[PDB]
């Protein structure tokens, strides 16, 4: 940074110190990444400057003939990652996707079935305080009590009887393959779409690592951050038939002036996802998360379905009689990012959760493999079962360090 | 940039030519504006990895020490610039802070009175084809016309008529001062609350250019680029009775994720509008503007409303048997980028048109003045009088050159 220091001290120190944070601290957090140098300079670009409702060449202002060539790239670029007939990679964010295919195919009071909640469901899939919960008619399917994979026929039992419009599958804590052949099955016996949100998956889906929604669902929506590595943002991808509903449900539907910086560092992303070396990245985020999983049971830890198929894990701290909240405190002051998350069936609110959840791939951006699992895996163990010794803690803190350097 | 390049040739390549682009032309498009390198730096930096969803020092997640203090920034320095008792940072977009408000005070339905969008709301303030005007019943009052003024009395009655639960007042495309005291009397009179949508004229406000809505206004909205000249995304200011509603409606109601990095831009930007230099910048948008009108009248041009009592002017193209899409064409061919746009009462389609908007925000960034104005109206005028004169259209091209240098 040249003219920021000079003009923003304060900004500019802020920044500074985040920096320093990202380096010092063990990303755990199952949704947080890394983006590349060259996806921070595009969303740094002068394409801020740039008004550009609509799309490419059929903008509502002059002068966007190459603003549209670094959209064109980002659709295009989508479509090859994801074999989807029409992409839409102007929405602001996770949230405004999912609203946008809300907006195309649901009228106020429409019933919508997703993933309850507190079993992995999303924010966006139907919370009473979210617009989706207050806008619609939102009922809940449930993972299994024992091995919390979902239950499909809970989700056709719930289908066949509230008959809903839209069913949403996909989660933001779930860490076992979701299989989109049966969710459209379903869909297809009562006649609803059925809407994919990958966002935690979709650099693993890019990377054939899970199973792609694109082919089953009507509609995919994710954001370009987390495990695709992109700058924060959603994108929206659909059959053709759809194309034209959702590029209106975006815009002049629910946004207005897409921001063009941001997405140039999609391109960048999707260019990034597309090569050879982020296949074997995301080979690794799965490889490790496994590795973690497997380490932290050797500790004695319970881990939510037993284990992951995917970049994330939930530890149950039932048996160690520690909540979430309590075990996202004392990790954090080692050096240790987790989140406090609710576990399918909780006995405790989502404000103090019997769980953690852990992902692995920020960890693996920064270089960390398999040992380093281990040892992640066993710092925690020395801290959970340690939580009132500060010699642990300090212990702890050094061996974080280690990792980081 | 430096990683860019190597990483994303077709990338990179695009947006240099809008960098190019962005000086060759003269860009009058009143909503336009050029951001400072700060901004930008601040737009490209690590804060793009950071999840921060709720508030400053009330986050869901650890780690936000530091994109907190850069959120309260933003925050602190928005309450000096516009005296408000609260302000919210994170919406996405004007759409996403419009869309906040609402969701706030309206149910599903319920009757609000905007700005008719043919004399000058925007697409947000009930669009029949946005989600202003699908979830709620918009009514409108328009302007005078003859003086193209707001009709105080027509706001008043259609008020007293319809018993909206909100006015909104502001505009995307008009050219004088709007009345707060009038608009709150009126709200006052029918018990409606009062928004005030200063997207267009936030820069002018800080400046003490324009009216502050913010006495006057329960909610007042805006975009953070425009003349305010920040980054590209939305802001919502309020009195401190609905701050806690208007945060919830951003978050967990319409949003999920702010964008980090994006704050920081507008913290930076909002730290610019609090100097003394951005303030004579300012005042020259305004005096720019006046002189760029009398420049066009001296042409033999017909101003809506007369003239300008802020950065931007609509050319009534009536008199000269032009369309706005045919003068927005041809322009275009010389290197003067404005858009078409629907004067009050036109007798054309919003698609055609018999009007064209220009603002002076961005050429006084780059900093033209009043010789400037006289030579672009001037320019303008040998265009718009010798549309079929191809001689006429070079001679307009090199000193249209001869200006950007």
């Known amino acids: 940074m040249k003219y ?43 394409l801020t400057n740039k008004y550009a409702q609509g799309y490419p060449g059929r903008r509502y202002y002059g002068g966007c003939e190459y ?35 809300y907006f195309t195919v649901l ?34 399917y449930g993972v299994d009590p ?35 052949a049966k969710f459209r099955e379903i869909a297809d016996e009562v006649g609803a779409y059925l809407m994919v949100d990958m966002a935690h998956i979709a650099g693993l889906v890019a ?22 590595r992109g700058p924060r943002g959603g994108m929206i991808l659909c059959q053709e038939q759809f194309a034209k509903q959702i590029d209106k449900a975006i815009f002049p539907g629910i946004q207005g002036g897409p921001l063009m910086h941001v997405i140039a560092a999609k391109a960048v992303a999707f260019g990034e996802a597309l090569q050879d070396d982020f296949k074997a990245y995301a080979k690794r985020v799965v490889d490790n998360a496994k590795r973690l999983a497997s380490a932290l049971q050797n500790e004695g830890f319970t881990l939510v379905s037993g284990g992951t198929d995917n970049h994330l894990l939930l530890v149950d701290l039932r048996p160690q009689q520690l909540t979430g909240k309590t075990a996202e405190k004392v990790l954090d002051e080692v050096g240790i ?27 693996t951006t920064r270089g960390f493999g398999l040992e380093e699992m281990d040892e992640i895996a066993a710092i925690i163990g020395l801290v959970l079962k340690n939580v009132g ?8 803190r050094q061996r974080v360090a280690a990792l980081t350097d």
Chains 1, 2 share one sequence.
């Open 389 to 396: 010794s500060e010699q642990a803690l300090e212990e702890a």
């Open 337 to 363: 990012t987790v989140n406090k998350n609710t576990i399918p069936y909780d006995p405790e609110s989502p404000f103090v959760t019997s769980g953690i959840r852990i992902g692995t791939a920020a960890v």
């Open 67 to 101: 603003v549209d060539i670094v959209e064109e790239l980002a659709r295009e670029r989508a479509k090859q990652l994801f074999g989807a007939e029409h992409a839409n990679v102007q929405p602001h964010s996770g949230a405004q996707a999912n609203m946008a295919v």
């Open 4 to 46: 920021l220091p000079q003009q923003d001290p304060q900004v500019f120190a802020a920044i500074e110190q985040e920096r320093k944070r990202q380096h010092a601290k063990i990303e755990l957090i199952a949704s947080e990444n890394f983006v590349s140098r060259a996806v921070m300079e595009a969303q740094g670009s002068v």
């Open 146 to 180: 024992e091995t919390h994979v979902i239950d499909y026929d809970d989700v056709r039992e719930k289908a066949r009887l509230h008959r809903p419009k839209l069913i949403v599958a996909a989660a933001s804590a779930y860490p076992r393959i979701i299989d989109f």
């Open 107 to 140: 009228e106020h009071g429409d019933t919508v079935l997703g993933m309850n909640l507190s079993h992995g469901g999303h924010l966006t899939h139907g919370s009473p305080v979210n617009f989706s919960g207050v806008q619609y008619n939102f009922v809940a």
């Open 207 to 228: 990377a054939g690592l899970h199973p792609n929604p694109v082919p089953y669902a009507h509609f995919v929506t994710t954001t370009t951050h987390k495990t695709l």
